[PDB]
Amino acid sequence: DKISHKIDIPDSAWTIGIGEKFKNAGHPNVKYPMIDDSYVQGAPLGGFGAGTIGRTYNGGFSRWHLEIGKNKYTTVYANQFSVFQKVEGNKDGVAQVLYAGEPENGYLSSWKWDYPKESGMYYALYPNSWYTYTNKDLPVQLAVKQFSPIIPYNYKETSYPVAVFKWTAYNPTNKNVDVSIMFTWQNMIGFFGKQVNVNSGNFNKIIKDKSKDSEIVAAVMGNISNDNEEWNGEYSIGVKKVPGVDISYKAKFVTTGDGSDLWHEFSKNGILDNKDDETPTKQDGIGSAIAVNFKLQPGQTIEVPFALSWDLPIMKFGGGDKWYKMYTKYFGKNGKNSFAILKEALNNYQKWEKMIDDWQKPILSNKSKPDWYKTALFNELYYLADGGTAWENGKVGEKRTNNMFGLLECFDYNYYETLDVRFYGSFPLVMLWPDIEKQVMRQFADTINVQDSSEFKVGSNGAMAVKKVQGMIPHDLGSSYALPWIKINAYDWQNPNIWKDLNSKYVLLVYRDYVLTGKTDKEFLKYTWKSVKTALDKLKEMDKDNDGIPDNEGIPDQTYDTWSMKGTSAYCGSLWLAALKAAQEIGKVLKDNEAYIKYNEWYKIAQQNFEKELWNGEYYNFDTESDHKDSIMADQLAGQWYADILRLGDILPKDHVQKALKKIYEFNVMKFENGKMGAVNGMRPDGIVDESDIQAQEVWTGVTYALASFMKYRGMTEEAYNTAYGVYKMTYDKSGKGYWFRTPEAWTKDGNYKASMYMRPLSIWSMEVNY
Ligand SMILES: [Ca+2]
Numbered sequence: 001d002k003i004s005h006k007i008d009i010p011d012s013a014w015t016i017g018i019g020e021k022f023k024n025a026g027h028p029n030v031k032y033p034m035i036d037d038s039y040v041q042g043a044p045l046g047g048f049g050a051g052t053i054g055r056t057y058n059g060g061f062s063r064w065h066l067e068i069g070k071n072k073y074t075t076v077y078a079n080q081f082s083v084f085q086k087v088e089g090n091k092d093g094v095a096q097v098l099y100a101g102e103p104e105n106g107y108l109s110s111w112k113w114d115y116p117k118e119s120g121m122y123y124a125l126y127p128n129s130w131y132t133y134t135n136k137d138l139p140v141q142l143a144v145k146q147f148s149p150i151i152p153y154n155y156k157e158t159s160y161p162v163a164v165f166k167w168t169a170y171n172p173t174n175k176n177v178d179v180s181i182m183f184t185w186q187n188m189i190g191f192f193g194k195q196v197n198v199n200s201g202n203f204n205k206i207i208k209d210k211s212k213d214s215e216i217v218a219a220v221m222g223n224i225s226n227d228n229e230e231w232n233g234e235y236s237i238g239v240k241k242v243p244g245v246d247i248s249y250k251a252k253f254v255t256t257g258d259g260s261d262l263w264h265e266f267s268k269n270g271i272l273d274n275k276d277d278e279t280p281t282k283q284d285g286i287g288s289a290i291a292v293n294f295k296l297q298p299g300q301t302i303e304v305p306f307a308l309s310w311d312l313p314i315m316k317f318g319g320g321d322k323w324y325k326m327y328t329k330y331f332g333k334n335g336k337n338s339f340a341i342l343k344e345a346l347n348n349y350q351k352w353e354k355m356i357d358d359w360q361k362p363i364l365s366n367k368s369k370p371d372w373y374k375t376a377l378f379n380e381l382y383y384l385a386d387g388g389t390a391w392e393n394g395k396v397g398e399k400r401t402n403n404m405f406g407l408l409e410c411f412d413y414n415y416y417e418t419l420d421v422r423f424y425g426s427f428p429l430v431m432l433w434p435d436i437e438k439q440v441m442r443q444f445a446d447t448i449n450v451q452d453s454s455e456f457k458v459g460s461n462g463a464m465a466v467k468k469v470q471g472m473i474p475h476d477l478g479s480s481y482a483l484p485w486i487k488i489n490a491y492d493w494q495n496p497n498i499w500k501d502l503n504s505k506y507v508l509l510v511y512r513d514y515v516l517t518g519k520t521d522k523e524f525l526k527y528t529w530k531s532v533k534t535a536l537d538k539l540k541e542m543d544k545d546n547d548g549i550p551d552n553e554g555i556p557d558q559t560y561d562t563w564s565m566k567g568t569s570a571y572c573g574s575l576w577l578a579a580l581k582a583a584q585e586i587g588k589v590l591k592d593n594e595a596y597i598k599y600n601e602w603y604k605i606a607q608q609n610f611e612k613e614l615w616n617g618e619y620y621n622f623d624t625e626s627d628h629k630d631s632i633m634a635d636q637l638a639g640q641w642y643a644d645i646l647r648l649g650d651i652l653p654k655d656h657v658q659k660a661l662k663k664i665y666e667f668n669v670m671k672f673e674n675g676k677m678g679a680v681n682g683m684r685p686d687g688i689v690d691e692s693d694i695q696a697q698e699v700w701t702g703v704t705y706a707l708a709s710f711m712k713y714r715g716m717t718e719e720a721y722n723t724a725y726g727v728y729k730m731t732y733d734k735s736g737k738g739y740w741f742r743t744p745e746a747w748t749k750d751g752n753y754k755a756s757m758y759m760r761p762l763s764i765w766s767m768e769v770n771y
Contacts, residue, residue: 001121001132001134001141002134002141002170003132003134003141003142003143003168003170004132004143006143006168006170006301007132007143007145007168009123009125009130010125010360010364011371012125012364012371012372012374012375012378013123013124013125013128013375014123014124014375014740015121015122015123015124016057016121016122016740017117017118017120017121017122018057018059018100018115018117018120018121018122018131018133019058019100019101019115019116019117019118019119022039022734022738024734024735024736024737024738024751025038025039025738026737026738026739026747026751026752026753027752027753028752028753028754028756029748029752030754034412034754034755034756035071035412035757036756037063037071037073037742037756038073039738039739039740040056040057040058040060040062041054041056041062041063041740041741041742042055042056042057042122042124042129042741043055043126043128043129043379043382043741044063044385044386044741045146045148045163045308046065046161046162046163046310046385047148047149047150047157047158047159047160047161047326047327047385048150048158048159048326048385048391048405048433048436049068049159049325049326049327049389049390049391049392049405050159050160050161050162050310050325050326050327051065051066051067051068051161051310051315052066052385052386052389053065053066053310054073054386054741055129055146056075058099058100058101058115058122059080059081059098059099059100059115060075060076060077060079060080060099060101061076061079061080062074062075062076063386064076064191064192065386065388066188066191066192066310066312067192067193067315068315068317068325068388068389068390068480069388069390069408069414069479069481070192070388070411070480071388071411071757072192075101076186076188076191077099077103077107077108077255078108078184078185078255078259078285078287079184079186080097080098080099080183080184081098081144081165081181081182081184082095082096082098082111082112082182082184083095083096083098083133083138083142083179083180083181084178084182084267084269084270084293085138085139085177085178085179085180085270086177086178086270087139087173087175087176087177087178088175088176088177088178088295093178093267093269093270094112094137094138095112095263095266095267095270096112096115096135096137097111097112097113098115098131099113099115100115100116100117101113101114101115102114106258107255107257107258107259108255108258108259108263110258110259110260110263110264111263112263112267115135116135119133119134119135119136120133120134120135121134124379124740125360125374125375125378125379126150126378126379126380126381126382127147127148127149127150127356127381128145128146128147128356129145129146129147130143130144130145130146131143131144139171139172139173139175140169140170140171140173140177140179140296141169141170141171141172142167142168142169142170142181143168144165144166144167144168145164145165145166145168145353146163146164146166147163147164147352147353147356148162148163148164148385149162149345149352149355149356150356150384150385151352151355151356152359152431152433153432153433154355155436156330157352158433159325159326159327159329159330159391160309160327160330160341160344160345161309161310161311161312161325161341162307162308162309162341162342162345163307163308163309163345164305164306164307164345164346164349164352165305165308166303166304166305166306166349166353167181167303167304167305167306168301168302168303169181169294169296169301169302169303169304170296170300170301171296171297171298171299171300171301173298174298175298176295176296176297176298177295177296178269178270178293178295179270179293179294179295179296180270180271180291180292180293180294181291181304181306182266182270182289182290182291182292183237183239183289183290183306183308184253184262184287184288184289185219185221185235185237185288186255186285186286186287187199187202187203187204187221187222187235187281187285187286187287188221188235189202189222189223189231189232189233189234189235190202190231192230192231193229193230193231193316194231199281199283199284199285199286200280200281200282200283201223201224201225201280202221202222202223202280202281203221203223203224203278203280203281203286204219204220204221204222204251204252204278204287204288205219205222205251205276205278206218206219206220206249206251206276206288207219207220207238207339209339209343214240214241214347215240215241215247216238216239216240216241216342216343216346216347217241217247217249217290218238218239218339218342218343219236219237219249219251219288219289219290220234220235220338220339221234221235221236221286221287221288221338222235222335222336222338223280224280228314228334228335228396229314229316230312230314232312232314232335233310233311233312233313233314233336233338234310234335234336234337235308235309235311236307236308236309236310236311236338236339236341236342237288237290237307237308237342238290238306238307238342238346239292239304239305239306239307239346240304240305240346240347242303242304242305244294244295244302245292245293245302245304246271246292246293246294247290247291247292248272248274248291248292248293249274249288249289249290249291250262250265250274250288250289251275251276251277251278251288252275252277252279252286252287252288253286253287253288253289254284254285254286254287255284255285255286255287256283256284256285257284262289266289266291269293270291270293271291271293272289272291290306292304305346305349307342307345307346307349308342309338309339309341309342309345310338311331311335311336311341312325313325313332313333313334313335314335314396315390315392317479317480317481317482317484318480318481318482319481319482319483319486320483321395321483321484321486322395323390323392323393323394323395323396324392324393324394324395324396325391325392325393326391326392326393326403327341328393329393329403333393333394359432360378363377363378363768370721372725372728373721373724373728373767375728375732376724376727376728376731376732376764377764377765377767377768379732379740379741380743380761380762380764381428383407383743383757383758383759383761384407384428384429384762386757387407387408387757387759388407388408388411388414388480389405389406389407390405390406390416390480390484391403391404391405391406391436392404392405392485402442404485405439405440405443406440406477406478406484406485407429407759408480408759409421409476409759410745410755410756410757410758410759411756411757412755412756413491413755414479414480414481414490415475415476415477415478415479415490415491416476416477416478416479416480416484416485416490417440417443417444417476417477418475418476418491418759419444419473419474419475419502419505419506419509420475420499420502420505420558420559421559421702421759421760422440422509422759423501423508423509424702424705424706424759424760424762424763424766425702425759425760425761425762425763426440426509426762427762427764427765427766428762428765430512430513430516430517431516431765431768431771434513434516434517437513438513438517438524441509441510441524441528442524443477443485444473444474444477444506444509444531445510445527445528445531447468447473447474447477447488448470448471448472448473448530448531448534448535449470449471449534450468450470450474450488451469451470452466452467452468453466453467454466454467455467458492458493458494458495459492459493459494460493460494460555460556460561460562463495465495467489468488468489469497471537471538472497472498472503473503473505473506473535474488474489474496474502475488475489475491475496475499475502476488476489476490476491478490493561494555494556494557494561498553498557499557499558500539500542500550500552500557500558500565500569501558501559501571501572502558503535503538503539503579504535504536504539504572504575504576504578504579504639505575505579506531506535507532507535507536507579507583508575508578508579508582508639508642508646510524510525510531510532510582510586511582511583511585511586511646511648512642512645512646514586514589515645515646515647516645522589522590525586525589525590529586529592532583532586533583533595536579536580536583536602539576540602545567547568547606547609548602548605548606548609549568549573549576549606549609549610550572550576551566551567551568552564552565552566552567552568552569552572552623553566554566554625554626558571558572560681560693561695562694562695563681563692563693563695563696564626564693565622565623565626566623566624566625566626566629567613567624567625567626567629568609568610568613568614568623568624569622569623569624570620570621570633570636570637571622571635571638573606573610573613573639574610574620574636574637574638574639574651574652575638575639575642576606576639577603577639577643577651577652578639578640578642578643578646578648578651579639580599580600580602580603580606581599581603581643581648581649581651582646582648583595583599584596584599584600584603585648607651607652610652611652611656615652615656616630618659618660618663619632619636619659619660619663620636620637620652620656620660622636622682626692627692628682628684630684630685631682631684631685631690631696632663632664632667632668632682632683632684633681633682634664634679634680634681634682634700634703634704634707635681635703635706635707636664637657637660637661637710638706639651640652640657640710641706641707641709641710641713644710644713644714645709645713645766657714658714661710661711661714661716661719662716664679665711665719665722665723667683667687668680668681668682668683669719669722669723671683671687672689672699672749673726673749675722675723675726676725676726676729677699677726677727677729677730677749677751678699678700678701678704678723678726678730678747679699679703679707679723680697680698680699680749681695681696681698681700681703682695682696682697689749695746697748697749698746698747698748698754699726699727699746699748700745700746700760701727701731701743701744701745701746701747701758701760701761702745702758702760702762702763703760703763704723704726704727705724705727705761705763705766705767706763706766707723708720708721708724708764708767709763709766709767709769711723712767712769713769720767724764724767727761727764730747730751731743737751737753739753739756742756743756743757743758743761744756744757744758745758745760
């Protein structure tokens with residue numbers, strides 16, 4: 001490996017061998033189907049709301065999230081980088097697709113597949129990833145840096161449906177070597193959203209944009225139809241000329257054939273035919289190819305940038321609504337702008353690289369933080385783009401001031417912005433894209449007094465319940481299968497209108513978002529204040545026994561939606577105390593004296609009773625009335641965690657909080673698989689995992705990272721990082737279960753998972769205490 005020194009890969013990048021097999025991998029162990037796309041994943045490409053494309057460590061473009069809200073795992077084999085090399089004065093060169101695998105059927109059988117093992121590495125530090133190619137039959141070593149411009153406090157480039165692939169080639173040998181790099185792409189119009197004749201009308205064109213000291217050559221893969229539909233638009237691939245390289249291309253090869261129409265050209269001398277052909281296809285799949293060829297002398301390095309863009313302006317959801325995607329604000333809505341997007345990337349990618357470096361540097365340059373922690377912190381952010389992210393710029397046919405946003409809970413439970421989960425999962429939004437975060441919370445504010453009296457069947461018991469109750473915060477903002485932002489509470493396993501955490505978590509989220517953006521946005525507090533008061537006032541009515549605390553009802557009426565709580569619970573009770581303290585403070589800021597006094601009185605009464613009911617001398621009991629009420633819950637003091645973040649001070653005595661956290665570390669962490677897997681949710685006082693419900697026996701990755709945040713705030717630094725380390729180990733390490741770029745909600749002690757690609761573990765950003 002002589003190429004790694006020519007490029008700048010951080011030591012904290014997650015690393016795996018190209019073609020590596022992973023032996024230990026976890027799977028769901030479940031009654032009903034659950035997504036399991038394997039451990040062959042990688043960092044995604046694409047901006048927020050753009051649709052994303054998962055290119056795996058094996059090189060394949062395989063995890064398609066281009067249909068917003070859907071996860072489709074299938075390798076489009078035509079989409080590749082390939083290399084040709086010939087040592088000067090040899091009869092023949094060699095050609096190789098840079099993919100560690102081969103097609104299932106006979107399509108593209110002419111191409112040289114099966115890139116060998118032990119011949120390169122994949123590296124990831126989101127939003128960047130890299131591949132190196134260090135192959136005994138390729139004298140010139142290659143690397144590529146690939147990324148999209150995901151940039152905190154930037155709402156423009158961060159939206160773009162674009163990726164850059166910056167190649168470096170180096171010749172460590174003492175012979176001249178002729179080298180070509182070729183990007184192939186299938187014209188994927190019709191891959192989704194088209195009900196009949198999936199390729200019909202697809203056509204490819206070549207654009208050569210020549211200007212002083214500049215040439216871009218690109219293929220634009222579109223359809224002859226000018227229909228404005230979800231399925232229609234364009235893909236583009238292209239390259240920018242640099243000194244010492246020539247460009248060649250082929251506008252049209254057949255992807256539903258043996259591929260030799262292209263490969264016989266590339267494998268001869270790495271130079272394509274430069275044949276334009278705009279003839280539309282009917283049944284056959286088609287694709288385009290862009291290549292560069294160059295001669296490298298001994299010791300010579302060259303850098304060349306390629307790019308990929310996708311202008312698919314319209315997203316359609318299952319309930320029929322069609323919306324424009326955010327990036328259309330910058331490029332237009334007509335779906336004929338892929339070249340413009342690609343050109344912007346090829347002419348600005350160096351600036352984008354620096355902008356990314358600028359926001360990663362503060363963390364990377366902090367040598368007090370271990371690299372493993374940095375690996376997790378950056379790579380967990382994959383989910384902000386990969387989570388079915390929807391970011392609208394108008395209804396098709398509809399203009400407002402704001403752009404509604406939603407991130408999915410996950411793909412198995414296809415719910416936008418699940419509030420009980422975003423309480424944990426939304427840290428990167430508030431910390432890095434706060435204008436999005438505030439927009440989402442205003443969306444929830446707007447729903448508070450919505451009433452929908454139509455009834456739905458509750459999954460857990462089969463009872464009928466009212467869809468949406470006035471004054472209760474919704475569970476979610478809908479599903480991609482139905483009508484995001486329009487039809488809320490898509491979730492039906494339980495009835496969220498009687499949840500005891502949603503209203504308090506909502507208030508806490510509001511005040512968090514004010515505090516973590518500088519305590520200056522009084523307008524945001526003013527917008528949400530009536531909803532905050534309504535939320536707490538409704539929840540107060542659920543106090544059945546006049547102790548001043550809402551009562552859990554012997555059912556799962558909160559985020560642990562199969563784990564019953566009854567009476568006063570540590571979880572909902574602490575959240576309530578913290579929410580009251582937040583509302584007092586908002587009252588003070590807005591000069592609403594009567595609210596301050598009311599919520600101060602509620603707080604003092606509830607705080608006194610919480611402590612009396614639950615403090616047992618060592619920790620806070622799970623609740624007052626359940627069968628295993630003295631279980632040690634990992635999340636027992638979630639309210640105090642948020643109070644620490646919100647600078648609301650002590651809701652419970654310092655000594656008791658410290659004792660509780662130490663108990664959780666000693667038991668839920670250290671007595672669960674030797675502390676190597678996170679914090680199990682429920683442990684009995686005798687040191688055995690609570691078996692009352694499956695959720696008690698699970699580690700929740702997002703709960704664990706939040707708990708590590710809590711410990712860090714409380715000066716339990718070693719316990720904090722040791723607690724978080726087990727989640728990192730399980731996700732990313734060779735000794736773990738292979739969950740990189742699909743971090744799940746949960747695992748059990750055997751490592752098997754629930755709900756891969758989950759929002760909650762974005763809570764790791766709550767560990768950025770100093771930030
Ligand atoms: Ca009560």
